[PDB]
Amino acid sequence: MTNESILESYSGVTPERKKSRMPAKLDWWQSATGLFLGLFMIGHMFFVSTILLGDNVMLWVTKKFELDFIFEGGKPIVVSFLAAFVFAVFIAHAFLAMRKFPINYRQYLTFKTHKDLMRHGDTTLWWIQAMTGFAMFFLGSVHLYIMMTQPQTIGPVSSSFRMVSEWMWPLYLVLLFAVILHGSVGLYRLAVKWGWFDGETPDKTRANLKKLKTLMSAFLIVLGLLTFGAYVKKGLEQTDPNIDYKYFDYKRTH
Amino acid sequence: MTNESILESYSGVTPERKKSRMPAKLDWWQSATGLFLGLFMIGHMFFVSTILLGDNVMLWVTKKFELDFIFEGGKPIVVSFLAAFVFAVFIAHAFLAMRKFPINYRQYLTFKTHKDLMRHGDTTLWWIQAMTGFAMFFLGSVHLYIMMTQPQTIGPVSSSFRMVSEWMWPLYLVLLFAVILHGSVGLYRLAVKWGWFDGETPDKTRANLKKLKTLMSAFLIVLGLLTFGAYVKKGLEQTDPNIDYKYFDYKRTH
Amino acid sequence: MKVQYCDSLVIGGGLAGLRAAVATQQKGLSTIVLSLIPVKRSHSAAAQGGMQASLGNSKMSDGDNEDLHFMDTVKGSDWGCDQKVARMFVNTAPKAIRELAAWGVPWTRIHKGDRMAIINAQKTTITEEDFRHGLIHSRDFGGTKKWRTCYTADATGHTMLFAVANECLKLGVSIQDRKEAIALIHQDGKCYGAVVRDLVTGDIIAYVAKGTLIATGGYGRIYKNTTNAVVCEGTGTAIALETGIAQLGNMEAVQFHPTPLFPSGILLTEGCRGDGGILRDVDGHRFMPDYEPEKKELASRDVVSRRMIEHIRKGKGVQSPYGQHLWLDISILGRKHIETNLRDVQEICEYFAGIDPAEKWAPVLPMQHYSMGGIRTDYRGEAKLKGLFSAGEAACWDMHGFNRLGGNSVSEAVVAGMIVGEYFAEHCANTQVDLETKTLEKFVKGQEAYMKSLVESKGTEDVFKIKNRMKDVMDDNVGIFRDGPHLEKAVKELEELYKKSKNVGIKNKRLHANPELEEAYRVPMMLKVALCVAKGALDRTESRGAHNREDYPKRDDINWLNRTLASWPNPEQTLPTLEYEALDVNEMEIAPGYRGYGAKGNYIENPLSVKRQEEIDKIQSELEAAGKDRHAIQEALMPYELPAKYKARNERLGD
Amino acid sequence: MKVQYCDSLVIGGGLAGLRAAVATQQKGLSTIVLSLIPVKRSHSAAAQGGMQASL
Amino acid sequence: MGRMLTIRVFKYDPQSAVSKPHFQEYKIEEAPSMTIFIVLNMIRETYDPDLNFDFVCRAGICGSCGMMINGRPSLACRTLTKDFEDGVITLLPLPAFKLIKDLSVDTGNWFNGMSQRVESWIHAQKEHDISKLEERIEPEVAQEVFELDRCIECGCCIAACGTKIMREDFVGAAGLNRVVRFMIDPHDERTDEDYYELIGDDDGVFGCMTLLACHDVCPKNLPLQSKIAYLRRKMVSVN
Ligand SMILES: *Cc1cc2c(cc1C)nc1c(=O)[nH]c(=O)nc-1n2C[C@H](O)[C@H](O)[C@H](O)COP(=O)(O)OP(=O)(O)OC[C@H]1O[C@@H](n2cnc3c(N)ncnc32)[C@H](O)[C@@H]1O
Ligand SMILES: *Cc1cc2c(cc1C)nc1c(=O)[nH]c(=O)nc-1n2C[C@H](O)[C@H](O)[C@H](O)COP(=O)(O)OP(=O)(O)OC[C@H]1O[C@@H](n2cnc3c(N)ncnc32)[C@H](O)[C@@H]1O
Ligand code: HEM
Ligand code: HEM
Ligand code: HEM
Ligand code: HEM
Ligand SMILES: CCCCCCCCCCCCO[C@@H]1O[C@H](CO)[C@@H](O[C@H]2O[C@H](CO)[C@@H](O)[C@H](O)[C@H]2O)[C@H](O)[C@H]1O
Numbered sequence A, B: 001m002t003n004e005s006i007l008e009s010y011s012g013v014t015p016e017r018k019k020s021r022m023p024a025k026l027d028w029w030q031s032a033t034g035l036f037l038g039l040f041m042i043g044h045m046f047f048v049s050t051i052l053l054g055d056n057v058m059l060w061v062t063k064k065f066e067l068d069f070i071f072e073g074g075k076p077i078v079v080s081f082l083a084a085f086v087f088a089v090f091i092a093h094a095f096l097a098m099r100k101f102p103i104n105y106r107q108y109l110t111f112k113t114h115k116d117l118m119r120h121g122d123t124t125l126w127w128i129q130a131m132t133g134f135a136m137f138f139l140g141s142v143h144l145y146i147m148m149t150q151p152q153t154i155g156p157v158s159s160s161f162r163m164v165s166e167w168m169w170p171l172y173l174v175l176l177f178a179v180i181l182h183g184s185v186g187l188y189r190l191a192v193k194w195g196w197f198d199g200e201t202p203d204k205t206r207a208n209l210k211k212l213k214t215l216m217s218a219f220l221i222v223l224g225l226l227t228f229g230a231y232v233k234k235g236l237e238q239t240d241p242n243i244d245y246k247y248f249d250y251k252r253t254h
Numbered sequence C: 001m002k003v004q005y006c007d008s009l010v011i012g013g014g015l016a017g018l019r020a021a022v023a024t025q026q027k028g029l030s031t032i033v034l035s036l037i038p039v040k041r042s043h044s045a046a047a048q049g050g051m052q053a054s055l056g057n058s059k060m061s062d063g064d065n066e067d068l069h070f071m072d073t074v075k076g077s078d079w080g081c082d083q084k085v086a087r088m089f090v091n092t093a094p095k096a097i098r099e100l101a102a103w104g105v106p107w108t109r110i111h112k113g114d115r116m117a118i119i120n121a122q123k124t125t126i127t128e129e130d131f132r133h134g135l136i137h138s139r140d141f142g143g144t145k146k147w148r149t150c151y152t153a154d155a156t157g158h159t160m161l162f163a164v165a166n167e168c169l170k171l172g173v174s175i176q177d178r179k180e181a182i183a184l185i186h187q188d189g190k191c192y193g194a195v196v197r198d199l200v201t202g203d204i205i206a207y208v209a210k211g212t213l214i215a216t217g218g219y220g221r222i223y224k225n226t227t228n229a230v231v232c233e234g235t236g237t238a239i240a241l242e243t244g245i246a247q248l249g250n251m252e253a254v255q256f257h258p259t260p261l262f263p264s265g266i267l268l269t270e271g272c273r274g275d276g277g278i279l280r281d282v283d284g285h286r287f288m289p290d291y292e293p294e295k296k297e298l299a300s301r302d303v304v305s306r307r308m309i310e311h312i313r314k315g316k317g318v319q320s321p322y323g324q325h326l327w328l329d330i331s332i333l334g335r336k337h338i339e340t341n342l343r344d345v346q347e348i349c350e351y352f353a354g355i356d357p358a359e360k361w362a363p364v365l366p367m368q369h370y371s372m373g374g375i376r377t378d379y380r381g382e383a384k385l386k387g388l389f390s391a392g393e394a395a396c397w398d399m400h401g402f403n404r405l406g407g408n409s410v411s412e413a414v415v416a417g418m419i420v421g422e423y424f425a426e427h428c429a430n431t432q433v434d435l436e437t438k439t440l441e442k443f444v445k446g447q448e449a450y451m452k453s454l455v456e457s458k459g460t461e462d463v464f465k466i467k468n469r470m471k472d473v474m475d476d477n478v479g480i481f482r483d484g485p486h487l488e489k490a491v492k493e494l495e496e497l498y499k500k501s502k503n504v505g506i507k508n509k510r511l512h513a514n515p516e517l518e519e520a521y522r523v524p525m526m527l528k529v530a531l532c533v534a535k536g537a538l539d540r541t542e543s544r545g546a547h548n549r550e551d552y553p554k555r556d557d558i559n560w561l562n563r564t565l566a567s568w569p570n571p572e573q574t575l576p577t578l579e580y581e582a583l584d585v586n587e588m589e590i591a592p593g594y595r596g597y598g599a600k601g602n603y604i605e606n607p608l609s610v611k612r613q614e615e616i617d618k619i620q621s622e623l624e625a626a627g628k629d630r631h632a633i634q635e636a637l638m639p640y641e642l643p644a645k646y647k648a649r650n651e652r653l654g655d
Numbered sequence D: 001m002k003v004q005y006c007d008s009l010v011i012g013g014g015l016a017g018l019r020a021a022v023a024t025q026q027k028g029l030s031t032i033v034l035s036l037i038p039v040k041r042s043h044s045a046a047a048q049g050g051m052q053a054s055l
Numbered sequence E: 001m002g003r004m005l006t007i008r009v010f011k012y013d014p015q016s017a018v019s020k021p022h023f024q025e026y027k028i029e030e031a032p033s034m035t036i037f038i039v040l041n042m043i044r045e046t047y048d049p050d051l052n053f054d055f056v057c058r059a060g061i062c063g064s065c066g067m068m069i070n071g072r073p074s075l076a077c078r079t080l081t082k083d084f085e086d087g088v089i090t091l092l093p094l095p096a097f098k099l100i101k102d103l104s105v106d107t108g109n110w111f112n113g114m115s116q117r118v119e120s121w122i123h124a125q126k127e128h129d130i131s132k133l134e135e136r137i138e139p140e141v142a143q144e145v146f147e148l149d150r151c152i153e154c155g156c157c158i159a160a161c162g163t164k165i166m167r168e169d170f171v172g173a174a175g176l177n178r179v180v181r182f183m184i185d186p187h188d189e190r191t192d193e194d195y196y197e198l199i200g201d202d203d204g205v206f207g208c209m210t211l212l213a214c215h216d217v218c219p220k221n222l223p224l225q226s227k228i229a230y231l232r233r234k235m236v237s238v239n
């Protein structure tokens, strides 16, 4: 604690008798981190779905992230950092957005009642945002620690192994619907909150962004469900007890 | 939404013009779930530390949870349920305790300042409770999903494999300090909050519980650090690439 | 006992009340504003025509000044107004606009260029010069030759009221709503405040002040059909009348609007007719030309309303479950013209009439709109009861006479608020009052007793049936056309209705938040108010301004160049006491003559008018020749007063 | 000017003032108690000897 | 007959110890161009003169009759029964406002508070002279200030706002809109930093969760959505 922080705490204002700018900075970062995770997921959905184009592609993608074009077979440790970075952002975003959850019986009760009474779309969607986000506290943390600590086990074989033999599909199945509804709605809201694309006909702009939002969700869900099945089937075809599937892909180019 | 919930939302009271009892029920369950996770961890710390008494003991413990004394080599699926149950409680407790976090800039600022100014023990400890609890959102979720989805990979060998070859030790190391400080302080507070052991000299009782609290923490930390090293060393001695350590223990009695 | 003290007490939170509150607060007088509802919801917010003020900015405003505005007002009043007050008005109106402008009122501005304009004497185009650009605009409204109605798009009253309310908040005025003045505190002929009922708690509280101002609006809801808000029931007027000292002026002077939506009464701005709107009967026949070949549906409002009633009487009216009405056809103006110029009229008809004005016809019928009558005051705004002032529609400052000018009422609210505000402020600061607890206690215990008696009455009469019967009587007998026989019938029935109103019984017994109990004490007040209008309408045997006596078609300048003054000195009497204040022609800047609209030579000429007229022609010519400005000439014809603060002249474009 | 009215004005929030305030309020008289400090901090709070009364 | 409408009304007198929250039903026969204003008055004068409600202009201008009509905060006087294919209309007092009784809440005083909080009045150093030509303003600017100044403080955007329902110190949509109304007014001399000292906190603009319910229920169709966003961008750039 610093004098300024003592003075601000006790006076309600900064030493210059002005309101803190922290709320502004905090608001900014919440959107920034939300925006980063948002875009990240769009991309992530594609690069992970490459397995619909054959193991050679998937494997090709996997290798490039490990900076294939700079090291021997590529150092998986690259993915460890890539993951640690996303995890941190993930933590930070949750920490900031968390401030927005209803937080006691009264708030929860009155808001839930209101939502059901209102039957208002954008209000209902925020509830979804709150829920899915809360759910990811558990679902997201799991996935992020593995990718970070087992980067050398990514591949058409290995990934399919974890998906099925390690029972990740149930988690993955749920996280898929969660992060996509969360992210796309969060992106839509992010746009109308800051009005980047308002223009002269905000009403028309918003109307478009809503259709856009839904479309993006449907697409990513279908794509994600297809990619899902892909990983599932392959895993279910790994019957040989003499083959080490978990590290099979790694055992090709070190 | 029901009429009563509409009426309560809009009137501030129940249909009988009485205040909701939900706050009471909510308070109760927060302590109950906290108490369960608390006791669970005490026990958990012992049954997991059995490896300091040799693989035969550890393996013996592992097998009994899978209801060894009822099935062939014991069905690991038992542990899956045991874990799912703890996970749910874990979720529920976090959901209820979450209500108690500071939740905006002002609250966080003024409370942090106050804590540093006060230099008051029990106040500082609550901050620890808040922190560690928040940290476990991520740390705890990881561990719980594995035990639940890979129960057949528990054992002196297998566990040691994950600890080292799967890089869980870093997570485990941190979660160890987190859950123990959280749990023991939570237990101490749980006692003075409800005053189960107050008696005629609450001041003397509280004084004891504080010494007790610290002792329990030190013990479990040392024990946990020893057990930690145990798993670590064994894992670091699993050099044979032809041995399947992850499922080695399972491959003994199915 | 509960007592609240302030230097200046204001009853009414509309334009007149709030502006007056600003005038007293700004000079250190602690002031309270009492209101039935949140102040920015007052009926003033409903104004959409505009505010009349001689700025002379726009092309059609060019040449305009105090004199032109003054004349429209006096001839418009049919010579029933105090011309000196009218002068005080027209002179200050310009500065009211500018002050409101300085306060943020988003007045529509002028922009260089030509624009599509309807003059219906030539639906030609108008050009606004470059030096006019950015100045406050004006529109054709009120039938004045000179276009001087200022506006803020289609929500003039709204924005105006908000600015004044906000100034009140800025100055820290005490705004206390859901509070109703039910009686005035007075002793030895001086007003010391008011007994107030908290509409929420039901507490009876005494509000004492060195000066009390009533700005309670009009008494339009004593009619069944009216444009007025449901809170314009004249109780402000009533509590003044119930002191037995203060007097009401020209209560029979009620003004009607010809095109309110039927039967709701929701107003359909005069711009409908002005832009081309067509009035049709049951057969779809455009009938105005039948009666007014020249002006047609562009005749003065006064005329149109009469014609519409005549036509209906001739049996050409539409039969509806709520009565007979006529049709307003704006569709012929085109769809593009409505959705841009009358986009607000299109919403009114859809939301409330369930019709698209661009496809269907709107049911219309003349209805009560403005109340020229009110608490009688001198030019300063003070009543016969010392320390009691009045401003706005609730008063009879009298600048309206028997026909207020369209655009002059919201104008008067703010202007009177400024001028009476000054005089009121001066009174409060200078006067010294002797407040006796014995008297406060009498009035407070008095009203507590009354409330209690209402709640305990075993009477079997129904307050609503009594109230509704009253509004029917008024609509059927005291409307646009009046004749002695029917007025006598109305007066007799209103008086009977009054007596039964005292045998009312109410189901709900509580003292707090009781709408039934509110009606219980309000209706009796509304009835005493209606009696003044009805009985005053019966005794005035002549036809002047809005007062049309079929049995007395001519305006009598010999026996009726006066003002009706109503009082109720004896609480036991059942009919108002009327007296007359004669308008002295020798003090008129303009002698009684033709008004401009309607028949001609329809007035028993007064010989002193002619004599005075010369005196005018003489004095005018001598000075006009001797090289003298319109100012010096005015001063010579009729000198008037004005608080120092508003004595300055009004700078205009082209000075 | 600021004016506050009450039937019974009490200057002092100690034992005598507050008790007198009870006597006037209980019988419908609107009463105000003025004090330099919060009433329960009056010097009366310092008494530790006791109250004399022939029980 | 016009068809029987079932009117469910929320009733509760917090000032009465014996009163308890409950609903009451009335059977009204629909009529042409029938509004909720007509209905409530019918009920008052012939079925139950106990029911409390606030009506003034009955013309959608004053913003007095805001209430929940089938879950949506809206103006009673401007609502037509005809628009309910069910004949079942449920009325609740506006949430987020102190309840007086039944359908009557205190919106007026909350708004006056909101007006003071944002200092809702022109801030200028020099007082113009009211006897001289008014200062010139571009007609387009005047039109814009007017658009936002059209707010009739009906309270519907406050009651529609879930955020405000949960956190009562939230200044609300109407409050945010009021700021922009003065921000874009040439007559007002306040700068962005000035407005930051008013709504630059968690109870202010950063408290908005962009639920947009306000924008979708506003009976005057004020450009709330874009205007709130406009203000957020500007306030997040102070310093
Ligand atoms: C009805 C109407 C009038 C109108 C108009 C449109 C409509 C639908 N358009 C106009 C226009 O375009 N140009 C114009 O010049 N005038 C127009 N008018 C008439 C004009 O609006 C009125 O003459 C003017 O608004 C009157 O202002 P005033 O300040 O006098 O009154 P108010 O706004 O009605 O407010 C009265 C206040 O008094 C309070 N009140 C009333 N009785 C009591 C009691 N007993 N106790 C306590 N308070 C009381 C009311 O609450 C209100 O605030
Ligand atoms: C000092 C003392 C007195 C005392 C005692 C111990 C001490 C340390 N022990 C006593 C005991 O055991 N038995 C006993 O009988 N008496 C004892 N005393 C004396 C006793 O406490 C006092 O006589 C008694 O408390 C006096 O009561 P009183 O009600 O008169 O007064 P108060 O408590 O001092 O409160 C005075 C109030 O007046 C307000 N005040 C004063 N001046 C102003 C002005 N100008 N304007 C507005 N308010 C004013 C004070 O704020 C206070 O509340
Ligand atoms: C990769 C996963 C995640 C993605 C794709 C992501 C993305 C987003 C986006 C785009 C927003 C918009 C933020 C803004 O309006 O500024 C948002 C809002 C939100 N997120 Fe996340 N999020 C993620 C994880 C989480 C987690 C773990 C939590 C848990 C606390 C969470 C809680 C919230 C909440 C409650 C909001 C609403 C905040 C508000 O309305 O102000 N999010 N998120
Ligand atoms: C640097 C960070 C990340 C990396 C390296 C990564 C990597 C991967 C990979 C390779 C898979 C394939 C299956 C497997 O290998 O087990 C996958 C699947 C998945 N990831 Fe991620 N991921 C990251 C972050 C995230 C985040 C933050 C979320 C959202 C909380 C997420 C949600 C998912 C989901 C739902 C799938 C399932 C795909 C489907 O079945 O359609 N990932 N991820
Ligand atoms: C196995 C892990 C956990 C254990 C051993 C546990 C145990 C406890 C105990 C004994 C309490 C006392 C509760 C009471 O006073 O009623 C407590 C308090 C608390 N816990 Fe946990 N907890 C666990 C996980 C979590 C998680 C995941 C969160 C995250 C939201 C959390 C957040 C809190 C907070 C903030 C409090 C303080 C609540 C208050 O002061 O009212 N806990 N916990
Ligand atoms: C039914 C639930 C649980 C089961 C089956 C379980 C099982 C185990 C097992 C077998 C290990 C040994 C290493 C390994 O196999 O990977 C372990 C270690 C550990 N567990 Fe759990 N656990 C459960 C719940 C929890 C919870 C709720 C926490 C606290 C959030 C926790 C914290 C830890 C920690 C910190 C260690 C490290 C021990 C040390 O190194 O001293 N466990 N657990
Ligand atoms: C949408 C995610 C919410 C984010 C998490 C933080 C905010 C919500 C939790 C803080 C307040 C505690 O929330 C409290 O939870 C209990 C759940 O047993 C709810 O209980 C109510 O809803 C649950 C779920 O539909 C029903 O099974 C239960 O019968 C009902 O009484 C309380 O009405 C709520 O007020």
Ligand SMILES: CCCCCCCCCCCCO[C@@H]1O[C@H](CO)[C@@H](O[C@H]2O[C@H](CO)[C@@H](O)[C@H](O)[C@H]2O)[C@H](O)[C@H]1O
Pocket (backbone or CB within 6 Å): A022, A026, A095, A096, A098, A099, B101, B102, B103, B104, B105, B106, B108, B109, B127, B130, B131, B134
């Ligand atoms: C103890 C766990 C807290 C539970 C989580 C929920 C409550 C806390 C978060 C909600 C409020 C947001 O909290 C906000 O975070 C930022 C962190 O960048 C803090 O920022 C401040 O502390 C951090 C950490 O010491 C410093 O690096 C930073 O320079 C300083 O300005 C704000 O003072 C705080 O108000």
Ligand SMILES: CC1=C(C)C(=O)c2ccccc2C1=O
Pocket (backbone or CB within 6 Å): A043, A044, A045, A046, A047, A048, A058, A061, A062, A065, A066, A079, A082, A083, A154, A155
């Ligand atoms: C974001 C990302 C990263 C960082 C990977 O290492 C990776 C590896 C294999 C398939 C998809 C991915 C992927 O989508």
Ligand SMILES: CC1=C(C)C(=O)c2ccccc2C1=O
Pocket (backbone or CB within 6 Å): B043, B044, B045, B046, B047, B048, B058, B061, B062, B065, B066, B079, B082, B083, B154, B155
């Ligand atoms: C709680 C628990 C459960 C449920 C186990 O299955 C287990 C298995 C092996 C060592 C410790 C444990 C253990 O502590």
Ligand code: SF4
Pocket (backbone or CB within 6 Å): E063, E150, E151, E152, E153, E154, E155, E156, E157, E158, E173, E174, E177, E217, E218, E219, E220, E221, E222
């Ligand atoms: S902004 Fe719209 S909904 Fe909100 S108070 Fe104003 S007019 Fe009503």
Ligand code: F3S
Pocket (backbone or CB within 6 Å): E160, E161, E162, E163, E164, E172, E173, E207, E208, E209, E210, E211, E212, E213, E214, E215, E228
């Ligand atoms: S609904 Fe509330 S959250 Fe913001 S967008 Fe409107 S004020």
Ligand code: FES
Pocket (backbone or CB within 6 Å): E054, E055, E056, E057, E058, E059, E060, E061, E062, E063, E064, E065, E066, E075, E076, E077, E078
């Ligand atoms: S009564 Fe005025 S808006 Fe509804």
Ligand code: NA
Pocket (backbone or CB within 6 Å): C371, C372, C373, C374, C392, C393, C394, C395, C396
């Ligand atoms: Na009048």
